[PDB]
């Protein structure tokens, strides 16, 4: 596919349809300029590591169908996508640094040993998957002839996090291969050995539009701290610190759960700076609280349904000093630091 | 500090910690790309006048502690910072065009005659200050062995304007040297001779989040113009023009106080265009009022507590035509044009 | 024509053939990168004012047939070429700043009032010419049904100045139209009125390969100045200055004929700096003579057959102070400053 | 290796030594600027497809030892070099588009199926080679326990073509693997089947410094065409066309042997334009002859020792119309078009 | 001075004259495009570390008068030029990284402690010099009321090394100040203490145009090594190594005098790669000898008149192992490593 055809597709279909046609173009720095009706208009701005003309081709070929949130693939260590490209709207670039059977200039000649993502919706994906050394195969339908594990009920659709598709619940099943063998999933046990059932998933909410998803989260947003803690008997779980956060010192204390930041935002502006910006299970922020003038340089934050967080804390018989509990979130084992006075997610 | 180490610090600490480590990087135009987990991500976008790799080093080394708002240093004509760098978040670049004892590539060899800012929190700052020809020394604690003047109670913390730090009132004291001699501050008099006590300070509010800070400002936002003016006996001070603004002509009339724009925004969208964007005591805008379709090319606007503005107007015995009153704001003498029918800040 | 097809043509044919095919490409700054045999190679470097992808298309579509030297068209004030593009190899860019019926992105919608160059070898050129308001039509064959004037016997062929084509003498005839009327050429008279027969043409030689073209030029290169001057009775024509040049002062004296620089180069290195570099009848150089350390900032130089220069000087009855003789060279009237002691070409 | 360290190495050692140290740097467009003695100097200009900072690292790590000319590896279809990088001085960039065990940012994670070049001088190269699926192993010494074929006696040393190294004859042996099996070389037969012994090698000469390498080439340069042809009985081999070239038409005739261009250059300036510039066995030029004004768009040229060319022509019993003889040159089968009146190398 | 005016000056005068006028311009990457006669032409290509529009202003304001070769100022550690700018033609950029009283955008506000170069030809230079803390003052005439030392008789004139100016010998006198005091020069002694009279100067020749400057250098170029050595009794001074160089090993031996490289070039092509390219007393090259295929990574080379080199070697009573002789060249002390078998200049 040529630049002119790609731009023609982007302008008339919003993405690459494979349709014929051409639009006069000009590449200037990270700008792609198309001449439309004798007028020059910027149709693409390159914020990727690729050459500008190559970047617009990759964006035009981006997947416009719903797919599992990218943080899951990162957690599964996906290296390249088989015959499709995923656009990371938070990152404002492509997901993988390389492609396969997608773009001539960027396609890898060899992916034998890389971790390949195969989407059941692409023709030949399953056959390619069964022959790969390392990979992940996803499908919206549970396949009885494959050992699979279900992902959470939410997808990335054109960068929008949705819980339904066509007004129907989102459903994604996962199959995995490593070193030539299928990973066999059973109903019980932990996904990884000591060093966790794989059912805990982050909620994917944004601070600017956070919304309670249960009655407990609803109370946490409306009731005073004292009231909330007693109602759900969270006595010795130090929520004041870990979840509510303390703003009476130069350095913010706790504040590791997204809903906690959401609650603070109700009475005080929280400004967040993020250095590595892309969909991830655990985020690392430089946080500044306006009202108090308090702040912290590396404040790890995770968006867990509060109900899920409490079950995690009540499962710990905190009666051990410097712990290092492992919690499997979004299919990956994350180590949470647990002093008998704090439960914070660590930087991984 | 190398590019790879700087990027490693930026990614893991949010700023330069001095910690060891390296991340593979790529510089492309104004983009700094880091390879994280075999994925390429843009961690910095250069909107500074410096080379991209140099710009990310300066940003990473930016001050993350609270400091006096930059408009004050501009008013004091600071040329360079001693052993630290201030990031201007409104400008989206570094404050000074040069550095000293911070970055190899940009550090000045000689700063003998420049106006140097010394922050008491940096080791050796006071000694360096006492030996400088021209400079300003700031400290959060009043030093009895230095002649100092207090700044307003608000600071710039990671670009956020805060009135407290650690939930404690912000406090900054200023000491100054010029041509080898200490500036001696007394309790009374004007900071500058005729051509003003240095206690009038701008409020630092943003139109998108403006908030009344007194009962008078509260009334100004809620009561009708007629009601407000009578309540505070502001008869012959022409507030309808200067503070409320008139929108019944092609060219907006008056509208020189920020709270005035804030009030208009309540019923009509005000679109502001600013050509020189950085923290300043007086702003110069190209303003367009949506409801009326009125506008003005160079509308000077200052954010003074309304209570302070009224005291300034009532101190004038306006009974003199084309005046040119001098008002010391944020440590600097600004000339306000005063026709016996208008009081507008002039372009300085 | 698309980028990929253009690059495919450039790589396989050296220019645009109209053949089908595509090569994966990447545009990076002024570099056009093609993937050939899985290898990345720079096939074009943009030194034009056009966007890189547009520049390579224009270069690929460049004329590869012999045509009149560009200095002639500049002298005729050509604004755009009809259905073809001329590449200026000295300039390393396209000749005209605009195109017509050549490139979608750069083609002008209207050229009604511009001076258009029509090449008889392009289909429809003559008909287009006869209908234009202002233009020049060239053909390699003299057309009896058009009033035409012959150009010199040398052409630009892929940037190389040739006197023959296919080992046959170069022949180019010129027809011109202005304000809707054909310019009628007769055998005698001057091309322009007072303010010159149009038979004087520059020789197009390069200093690095200068070659005598007559017996007089041969003698000028081999005989001593004294010997040469007497042999051709050039007593009161001050050749020592104007043609030979004097190098006994800080500022070089005279040196306005190319052959003169050629002769000096025989015993002393002459370094030339040119600020506007493109084929022109008269050049303006910053010249530095190595042996003497003498130099001149704006030294105008013209490459006339010495035999032609002498006929021009002997036609002047220099017995008039500050003259300002007009000499028609390459179809254009150039004013030569003539003090009864110097004959230098002026800056036009 | 960081940017600052790489630049430090480049400046002090000419290449990457692994030595410690740092030089302040600035990356601007394709320029790498180092601050040396408080002065800013451009130490690298990027003409590669890689990010500038990455390009200087690759150049600094370039091989500075003698190695087989790159046209040989291209002929062997090398995809990547194992643990080293080859700089192509004609191309002014790196040879392969990817690296392996050389540069963090550009290294491929997987090269299992690519054609890998292993240089016996790098530790572990032979072991890596014996385990690869597809590759070429070179050594300066003949290894008795490997099936190998000798290359020509000339190497690329810092871009210079040399016949000796340390004043000793250049010697390079080649071992090859394909699809997991060693290629077994015998003393006789053709390297490839019908579709040639692998002993014919190009001479690697440049037109600007061409030098006869035999008595026949010496005569070809000094004797007239008639004289030469009779002396070596080359009657019906049409050298006038194929080797000497004809310049009596618009389109040059023949001229496919480099020595032929060399001979023409003796009396007429030949200007060559090349669109894909990198070391290759057969070149494709746009050629323009100055004296005659003749030219050809795609003139294939090969630099064979004339003695070798004649043996190739005398082996053909040209008594067959449109042939298509296969000649193995530089380890690769090239098809030469042979009409009973012309023998030209085809475009491959 | 504005961009348009600067470009107007560059185009019409070759440099900034201060004349009025404007040319429409466009800045694209490192290209400055001027619209001349409705045609677009690149008049400047930025290879400096400065913004393109700033770079063309600095080039236009470059000194076009003769001045001491830049290697001398580097040796004197000049930091900035007072009221003028020196263009380094070998470097293809400005000499100093900063300016003073030359260009608004790049001028330093403070130069009190920097080493300033004052040229006696600029009005006010001497007065400015006498008031500076650290600086060098040069004049073409010896000033009786200043302690001065004479430089060599050669100057940089528009990048050309000349021995005469206006056909008169080049003459430059040097006066120096350090820490507020004048440096007092006497007729005898060494310029620096132990750690050399300051009369040894490099010859400034280029390999591509090297020319013998004495009878000894003439013999060195024409006579065989044996013949030369005996004629000038250079028995135990190992010239075969140090001056002639040995090419019978992988690594070139000796070859530290420019004339030596010049002599080799007579029978073998020497290819030189230089990483830091600007006028310097001692050069560091990566050298490759074509005929032998020998090479050296860091070969220091100095261009001393052979007569001067021999006097230096005969002054050494080499009867001491690992010496470290100090030789003052171009006003600077350079340490030459002297094993009782080799005399090579060290890397400084």
Swiss-Prot record, chains A, B, C, D, E:
Function as written in the Swiss-Prot or TrEMBL entry: Plays a role in viral transcription/replication and prevents the simultaneous activation of host cell dsRNA sensors, such as MDA5/IFIH1, OAS, and PKR. Acts by degrading the 5'-polyuridines generated during replication of the poly(A) region of viral genomic and subgenomic RNAs. Catalyzes a two-step reaction in which a 2'3'-cyclic phosphate (2'3'-cP) is first generated by 2'-O transesterification, which is then hydrolyzed to a 3'-phosphate (3'-P). If not degraded, poly(U) RNA would hybridize with poly(A) RNA tails and activate host dsRNA sensors.
NendoU domain location: 211-348
Please tell me where this chain falls within the complete protein, as first and last residue plus total length: 6504 to 6872 of 7176
Catalytic function, reaction form = uridylyl-uridylyl-ribonucleotide-RNA = a 3'-end uridylyl-2',3'-cyclophospho-uridine-RNA + a 5'-end dephospho-ribonucleoside-RNA
Which gene specifies this protein's sequence?
A: rep
- Compartments reported by the entry: Host cytoplasm, Host perinuclear region
List cofactor names only. Answer: Mn(2+)
Q: What protein does this entry describe?
A: Uridylate-specific endoribonuclease nsp15
Q: Where is the AV-Nsp11N/CoV-Nsp15M domain positioned along the sequence?
A: 63-183
Residues in the active site? 241, 256, 296
Cofactor binding comment, as recorded:
Likely affects Nsp15 binding to RNA.
């Amino acid at each position: 596919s040529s630049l002119e055809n790609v731009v023609y597709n982007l302008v008339n279909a919003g993405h690459f349809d494979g349709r014929a046609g051409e639009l006069p173009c000009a590449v200037i720095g990270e700008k792609v300029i198309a001449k439309i009706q004798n007028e020059d208009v910027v149709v693409f701005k390159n914020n990727t590591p690729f050459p500008t003309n190559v970047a617009v081709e990759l964006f035009a070929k981006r997947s416009i169908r719903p797919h599992p949130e990218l943080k899951l693939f990162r957690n599964l260590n996906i290296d390249v996508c088989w015959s499709h490209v995923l656009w990371d709207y938070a990152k404002d670039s492509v997901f993988c640094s390389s492609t396969y059977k997608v773009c001539k200039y960027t396609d890898l000649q060899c992916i034998e040993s890389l971790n390949v993502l195969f989407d059941g919706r692409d023709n030949g994906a399953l056959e390619a998957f069964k022959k790969c050394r390392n990979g992940v195969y996803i499908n919206t339908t549970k396949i009885k002839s494959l050992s699979m594990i279900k992902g959470p009920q939410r997808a990335d659709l054109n960068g929008v996090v949705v819980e339904k598709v066509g007004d129907s619940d989102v459903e994604f099943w996962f199959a995995v291969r490593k070193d030539g063998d299928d990973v066999i999933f059973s109903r019980t046990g932990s996904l990884e050995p000591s060093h966790a059932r794989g059912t805990i998933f982050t909620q994917s909410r944004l601070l600017s539009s956070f919304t309670p998803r249960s009655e407990m989260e609803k109370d946490f947003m409306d009731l005073d701290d004292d009231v909330f803690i007693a109602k759900y008997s969270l006595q010795d779980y130090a929520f004041e610190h870990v979840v509510y956060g303390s703003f009476n010192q130069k350095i913010i204390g706790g504040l590791h759960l997204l809903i906690g930041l959401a609650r603070r935002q109700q009475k005080s502006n929280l400004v967040i700076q993020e250095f590595v910006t892309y969909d991830s299970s655990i985020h690392s922020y430089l946080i500044t609280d306006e009202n108090s003038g308090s702040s912290k340089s590396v404040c790890t934050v995770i968006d867990l349904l509060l109900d899920d967080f409490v079950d995690i804390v009540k499962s710990l018989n905190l009666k051990c000093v410097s712990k290092v509990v492992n919690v499997n979130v979004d299919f990956k084992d994350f180590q949470f630091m647990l002093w008998c006075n704090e439960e914070k997610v660590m930087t991984f």
